[PDB]
Design an enzyme around this catalytic site. Structure first.
Site, PDB file in Angstrom:
ATOM      1  CB  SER A 110      -0.915  -0.002   1.153  1.00 22.19           C
ATOM      2  OG  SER A 110      -2.065  -1.089   1.096  1.00 22.19           O
ATOM      3  CG  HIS A 158      -2.020   4.449   3.515  1.00 25.15           C
ATOM      4  ND1 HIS A 158      -3.226   3.877   3.774  1.00 25.15           N
ATOM      5  CD2 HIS A 158      -1.201   3.124   3.331  1.00 25.15           C
ATOM      6  CE1 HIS A 158      -3.118   2.498   4.030  1.00 25.15           C
ATOM      7  NE2 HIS A 158      -2.055   2.320   3.680  1.00 25.15           N
TER       8      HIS A 158
END
Ligand code: L6C
EC number: 3.4.21.105
Length: 174
Positions: A110, A158
């Site tokens: 991710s 992220h």
């Protein structure tokens, strides 16, 4: 057709995911996770290998789809070296931010996908001549995946991945 870095990563993620079905997630995490004890701090693959682990079919599938697409575009237009460096730096920084706030038990591409997304998007915004850009439909499809994870339908890691991507695109577009 997907270049060698794009290819080797997909296969590595496939192989690791097979090992997690066969041995259970925990045992694989025992060898590949970010150093979870000071006794492990000098096992240097662990600062990166956390990215190879996935914990559900949807995880690995959507991650490899974005990797194949964005990573593949980067490797094709800008070269394998570029893909490698984005991947190393985003994996390090997102893993670091993840363990700092939530401990060392985590995995997946991710962080890396957020980097590629930010990279491809900003690279096209500021320098179309590069031949690489994030298509309108994809800016949308991607944004719905941001929102999802963001509201958990961790975020800090992220964001860290994305910053790497934006930073490199910014550098490259001067
Ligand atoms: C990592 O964030 C797991 C997540 N994968 C995903 O969000 O990839 C993307 C896509 C677009 C922008 C950034 C990251 C995930 C969530 C739910 C199901 C599978 C994968």
């Amino acid at each position: 057709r997907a270049g060698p870095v794009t290819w080797v990563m997909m296969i590595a993620c496939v192989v690791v995911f097979i090992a997690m079905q066969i041995l259970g997630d925990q045992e694989v995490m025992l060898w590949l996770a970010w150093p979870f004890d000071p006794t492990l701090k000098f096992e240097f693959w662990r600062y990166f290998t956390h990215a190879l682990m996935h914990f559900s079919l949807m995880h690995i599938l959507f991650n490899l789809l974005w990797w194949w697409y964005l990573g593949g575009a980067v490797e094709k237009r800008l070269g394998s070296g570029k893909l490698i460096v984005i991947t190393l730096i985003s994996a390090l920084l997102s893993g670091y931010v993840q363990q700092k706030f939530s401990g060392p038990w985590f995995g997946g591409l991710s962080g890396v996908v957020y980097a590629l997304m930010g990279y491809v998007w900003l690279r096209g915004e500021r320098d179309p001549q590069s031949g690489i850009y994030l298509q309108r439909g994809l800016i949308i499809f991607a944004l719905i995946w941001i929102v999802a994870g963001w509201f958990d339908l961790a975020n800090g890691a992220h964001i860290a991945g994305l910053a790497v991507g934006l930073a490199m695109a910014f550098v490259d577009s001067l």
